[PDB]
Design a protein around this ligand. Structure first.
Ligand SMILES: *[C@@H]1O[C@H](CO[C@@H]2O[C@@H](C)[C@@H](O)[C@@H](O)[C@@H]2O)[C@@H](O[C@@H]2O[C@H](CO)[C@@H](O)[C@H](O)[C@H]2NC(C)=O)[C@H](O)[C@H]1NC(C)=O
Ligand SMILES: *[C@@H]1O[C@H](CO)[C@@H](O[C@@H]2O[C@H](CO)[C@@H](O)[C@H](O)[C@H]2NC(C)=O)[C@H](O)[C@H]1NC(C)=O
Ligand SMILES: *[C@@H]1O[C@H](CO)[C@@H](O)[C@H](O)[C@H]1NC(C)=O
Ligand SMILES: *[C@@H]1O[C@H](CO)[C@@H](O)[C@H](O)[C@H]1NC(C)=O
Ligand SMILES: *[C@@H]1O[C@H](CO)[C@@H](O)[C@H](O)[C@H]1NC(C)=O
Lengths: 96, 202, 204, 96, 95, 95
């Protein structure tokens, strides 16, 4: 648990991707604590950073990220042209 | 706001309508070559799929959305682009309507969809509803059922509500004028399209 | 005491009826989320399966049970709950009947049942039976054929028998007349009313 | 061949499960002697218990129990509210 | 709850009529089966309290063996062999 | 980009509480996953910039291990054996 999917209603313009339209969308993202799913690999990384054994590198630990992307969404812009977006929302999450 | 723009919003917010709306926009908007603007065959197959899987509240709410009757209104333009007419409707050569009927009647599905259209959308000046058969729903479906065939119709730019296939009439010509008039000036079809819009709008 | 309750007793004491009655009760009553009260799709699929495999003596004997006055009696309410209306009938949104006719006419099975209903339950004021086609059985089946579909009908809370689908004629436009004719064929139809009453008379 | 399945017709209220309903049911249970299916294990338990070798453990000998439960039953109570029961009747018995 | 227990006995302590000095290990099932309760059980308890069931005393969940142990053979005093089957429990379970 | 790196260490350099003079080879993932970002990642940055997602702070692409190396065992000063599992990375990828 913890790592969980959350939803929001936005204008297409709220994504600030440069489009010019009045359409709307529903955006889903992954957010939550992934402390419960840490491996010995993660603990070692945390102890190496504390003791500065690994001099400079900053390896990453468990991340709450999407493992499945949502269906594609299409919209119509002010100039009567069609645009389609892929991999814009998350369908399923996991501590990975 | 436009009843058509609000319908598109309601589609994107419905997972089923969003998925299948994107399913038909992509092929009709993907260019296969410099000469060919789209895979028209795959564009028609995705349109038909959109009207079969999406519930009617959304699918037909976008197609038959209510406009203010303003000439070249934003709603009307949005509604006109509903089918991606650049790929499904338009074509290089405008055929004669006699030849287009021979093509639709060779394909079993188009033939039935056309027969169902004329039978169910027959006008009657005496009838208060305008339809001889007195069922708007049976006329709306028979019409939409043509949206993925060679006889694909789409709105024309007029002050009124006019729909036509991509055909033109030029020995005998009255029979061809009757065919075009069945789409362009049919009080049964016009009253049905303005009935669904009244119901699926505010 | 109540013909409608005696029908249930006979059903639970019948192995085939008992099995399939519970088969549709559970899905239509098992919650799936704080928002959804049931899996409406699976609920309708069990209803149709109930009227297909349960013998008609028992299945229809419960749906058309004879009640003195189907308004606000125990007999009337037990019959109202036969299809578990909280899951199969009601809904968060009440659609316009034009949109509901379009939705039913897309589906082949719903279209055939709706066409058979308006043909076989046509009324005729000049008929002693009330039905133009003069066959109660053909009208009952056609009506029952709409239970599991998008046009699911159920008894309304009225003095006399009144049934309807979940649709309304809110539009003040000119289409109100064609919408009224549709609902009136369900609500106030002397042929359907005589058939339902006639069947309960027999299984009483 | 002695552990048999019997039938009884009852009210739902005769089961005293807390319901208030006038619905009826057919209850089926297992009852019979399992002396024909006893093994060396059983007659050992009988003797050991007599000798009191076992410290009051009183193991159980063969039982006439159900091996297959019957279909579920659903009923409507006096308050116009639906209920359903599972694993209430017996469909097949056997000396277990 | 229903668990398996062991005891070390003589073939004579089983009082099956044998005359021998051989020994054995006997395993049996004993424990509670309240966790494996079904409505069918409860209905039987409520009907026996009342007198609906007539002198039937049906049985509720029992803690019994579901798998028997390997056979055992021994030699008696008269230099004769005997073999016992299905005499000890290998696996228990609420039934 | 997201590449695997190696680093020789003691078994006590991991500060896991073990008592031993044994040694190990530790492999970790480190690299930029910018060339594998998607619309989902660009949307998150833009929403966190204008602060539409005021409360939460979701994660973007992480250079993480997709397969762990083999197990490693060692002997401590008290002549007791210890085995670690999932302690080093075998293959990396942008997740
Ligand atoms: C099912 O229940 C009926 C009704 O229960 C009776 O009435 C209750 C108020 C209570 O007093 C119960 O103890 C009663 O048994 C049973 O039918 C009645 O049975 C009694 C006992 O012989 C008899 O005197 C009544 O005339 C019966 N009919 C009535 C009360 O209307 C019946 O035995 C139960 N079992 C079934 C139906 O299988
Ligand atoms: C088999 O039987 C013998 C008796 O013949 C048991 O041995 C006795 O055990 C008790 C308790 O320790 C002693 O007080 C006796 O002196 C023993 N008798 C002899 C002759 O030694 C023996 O315990 C039995 N086998 C098992 C497994 O219990
Ligand atoms: C959508 O756009 C309108 C107009 O800019 C804005 O007021 C609104 O907050 C946006 N988001 C939602 C969910 O309506
Ligand atoms: C739709 O509503 C308008 C406005 O009331 C009305 O003029 C028109 O006749 C209606 N059309 C229908 C119901 O088909
Ligand atoms: C291992 O331990 C020794 C001291 O015992 C230390 O000098 C050495 O640096 C350690 N290993 C590494 C890789 O540093």
């Amino acid at each position: 648990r913890g790592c969980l999917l959350k939803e929001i209603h936005l204008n297409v313009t709220d994504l600030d991707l440069g489009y010019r339209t009045k359409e709307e969308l529903i955006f889903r993202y992954c957010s939550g604590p992934c402390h419960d799913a840490e491996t010995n690999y993660d603990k070692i990384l945390n102890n190496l950073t504390h003791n500065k054994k690994l001099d400079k590198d900053t390896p990453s630990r468990t991340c709450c990220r999407p493992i499945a992307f949502d269906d594609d969404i299409s919209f119509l812009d002010d100039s009567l042209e069609y645009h389609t977006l892929k991999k814009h929302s998350a369908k399923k999450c996991a501590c990975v | 706001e436009n009843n058509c723009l609000n319908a598109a919003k309601a589609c994107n917010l419905n997972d089923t309508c969003k998925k299948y709306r994107s399913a038909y926009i992509s092929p009709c908007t993907s260019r296969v070559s410099t000469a060919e603007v789209c895979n028209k065959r795959k564009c028609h197959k995705a349109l038909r799929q959109f009207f079969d899987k999406v519930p009617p509240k959304h699918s037909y709410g976008m197609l038959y959305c209510s406009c203010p009757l303003g000439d070249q209104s934003a709603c009307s333009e949005r509604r006109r682009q509903t089918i991606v007419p650049a790929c499904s409707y338009e074509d290089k050569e405008r055929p004669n309507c006699l030849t287009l009927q021979v093509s639709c009647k060779t394909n079993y599905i188009c033939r039935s969809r056309l027969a169902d259209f004329f039978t169910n959308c027959q006008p009657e000046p005496l009838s208060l509803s305008g339809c001889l058969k007195e069922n708007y729903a049976d006329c709306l479906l028979s019409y939409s059922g043509l949206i993925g065939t060679v006889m694909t119709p789409n709105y024309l730019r007029s002050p009124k509500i006019s729909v036509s296939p991509f055909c033109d009439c030029s020995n005998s010509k009255e029979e061809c004028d009757r065919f075009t008039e069945f789409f362009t000036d049919n009080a049964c079809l016009r009253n049905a399209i303005q009935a669904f819009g009244n119901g699926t709008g505010s």
